[PDB]
């Protein structure tokens, strides 16, 4: 049937028997004390942030290249967990990413829904670094391009290279899920916290980005809706922050 999932004061509905891609095989977990470690780096969990956050749906069209969000930044103004990023210096969390797609049986298209860790992106100008606005717009999706981007500090958003200088067709090496409208309409990726350090500043670094790239273009019969909404729902998992109390 249909399964309803509630986290805090938010509820979503998902079809049962829907595949869940669990990161690199690792479910998000809390940090573990190493043989009763001293209280020199106290950690503070937060369970109020474990709720669904629903970004504004992106309108998938016929000539529509991909979108991407950088989720440490994409949830930086979503009430809690954004206040938590602002208040705490060091943060650590995983995410459950739900990608819905509302289309009828008369719609066509395929989507690559991939979460790319450490997706450092190049600049349109070779001797430059892309700015914050182009790299991540927060809750607003940044869009890929069908041709080379132009700009002094703009991201090279041509979809063929996914902004990283690699083959876009080889993006499946990362935790991904294909959305074929004739077979699928949902994608669930559970991304564990991936970093070279146990905790890191969240304004200063993006753990991963989600790329939604239409490989097969959207198509429809005459009279059907010319666009298709793509909804991204995010539930932070196992959010930890540096303890603010005095050690003694």
């Amino acid at each position: 049937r249909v399964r309803s999932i509630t986290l805090g004061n938010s509820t979503i509905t998902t079809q049962e028997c829907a595949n869940v891609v669990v990161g690199y095989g690792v479910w998000p977990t809390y940090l573990n004390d190493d043989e009763a470690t001293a209280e020199d780096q106290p950690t503070q969990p937060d369970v109020a942030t474990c709720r669904f956050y629903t970004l504004e749906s992106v309108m998938w069209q016929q000539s529509s290249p991909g979108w991407w969000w950088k989720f440490p930044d994409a949830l930086s103004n979503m009430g809690l967990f954004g206040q938590n990023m602002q208040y705490h210096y060091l943060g650590r969390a995983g995410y459950t990413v739900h990608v819905q797609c509302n289309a009828s049986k008369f719609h066509q298209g395929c989507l690559l829904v991939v979460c790319v860790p450490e997706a450092e992106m190049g600049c349109a100008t070779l001797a430059n670094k892309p700015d914050q606005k182009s790299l991540s717009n927060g809750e607003t999706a940044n869009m890929f391009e069908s041709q080379n981007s132009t700009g002094q500090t703009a991201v090279q958003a041509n979809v063929i290279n996914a902004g990283m200088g690699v083959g876009v067709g080889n993006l499946t090496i990362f935790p991904h899920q294909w959305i074929n409208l004739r077979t699928n309409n949902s994608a669930t990726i559970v991304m564990p916290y991936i970093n070279s350090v146990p905790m890191d500043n969240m304004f200063r670094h993006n753990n991963f980005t989600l790329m939604i790239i239409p490989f097969a273009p959207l198509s429809y019969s005459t009279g059907a809706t010319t666009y298709v909404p793509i909804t991204v729902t995010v539930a932070p998992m196992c959010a930890e922050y540096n303890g603010l109390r005095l050690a003694g």
């Binding site: 190049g122 700015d131 670094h205």
Partner: protein
């Protein structure tokens, strides 16, 4: 060529250790025995992003953790000059490893050469090439080959970069001039990762590299083109 042979399913050197623990030449520089203003010394900041082959092989992963086994091939050649009767004694070279955050030599006779916390190897020519090993020197848990962040958030040019991938700097100089004549030595540093751990594999780089400290790229085709999609004649 390469006729069909039996498949023995050898996965032996497809492992990350045999894939990356290859000794590659990453740097070579020249320095003279006599210098105009004490600048007759070679140096190389240890980076894995200057040679495009080793860089691509390492960037096929997101995080790495390895040791730095460095081998130096120092060869000295006598330059042409009018000085006669040189008769140079054997030449000794000093190779200093400055750890991350250590004193940096400015000239060939700076105090940073005669320090105590910078590992230095003194090698006399005619012996086996000098060899030193640097451990996993990062204070983080791994070397991040990619960094979707800034060193300082309020700085535009700090994107990427990180601060935990600093592996130190190498410094090379002549201990003795030998003769009152021109002698120039090449160091030809050879790099070899050891005990490699890698995480989060990544697609191989498709676009040619532009800068050593950038991921910036000119957009390129996903592959070479062909005349027809079908194999018809």
């Amino acid at each position: 060529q390469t006729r069909h042979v039996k498949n023995y399913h050898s996965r032996s050197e497809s492992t990350v250790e045999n894939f990356l623990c290859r000794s590659a030449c990453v740097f070579y520089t020249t320095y003279r025995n006599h210098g105009t203003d004490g600048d007759n010394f070679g140096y190389w900041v240890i980076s894995t992003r200057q040679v495009a082959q080793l860089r691509r092989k390492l960037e096929m992963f997101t995080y790495a953790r390895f040791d730095l086994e460095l081998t130096f091939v120092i060869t000295s050649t006598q330059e042409q000059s009018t000085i006669q009767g040189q008769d140079s004694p054997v030449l000794t070279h000093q190779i200093m490893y400055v750890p991350p955050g250590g004193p940096v030599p400015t000239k060939v006779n700076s105090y940073s050469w005669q320090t105590s916390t910078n590992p230095s190897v003194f090698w006399t020519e005619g012996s086996a090439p000098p060899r030193m090993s640097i451990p996993f020197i990062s204070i983080g848990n791994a070397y991040s080959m990619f960094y979707d962040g800034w060193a300082k958030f309020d700085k535009q040019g700090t994107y990427g970069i990180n601060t935990l991938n600093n592996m130190g700097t190498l410094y090379m100089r002549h201990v003795n001039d030998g003769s009152p004549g021109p002698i120039v030595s090449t160091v030809r540093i050879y790099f070899k990762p050891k005990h490699v751990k890698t995480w989060v594999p990544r697609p191989p780089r498709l676009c040619q590299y532009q800068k050593a400290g950038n991921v910036n790229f000119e957009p390129t085709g996903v592959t070479e083109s062909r005349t027809d999609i079908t194999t018809m004649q």
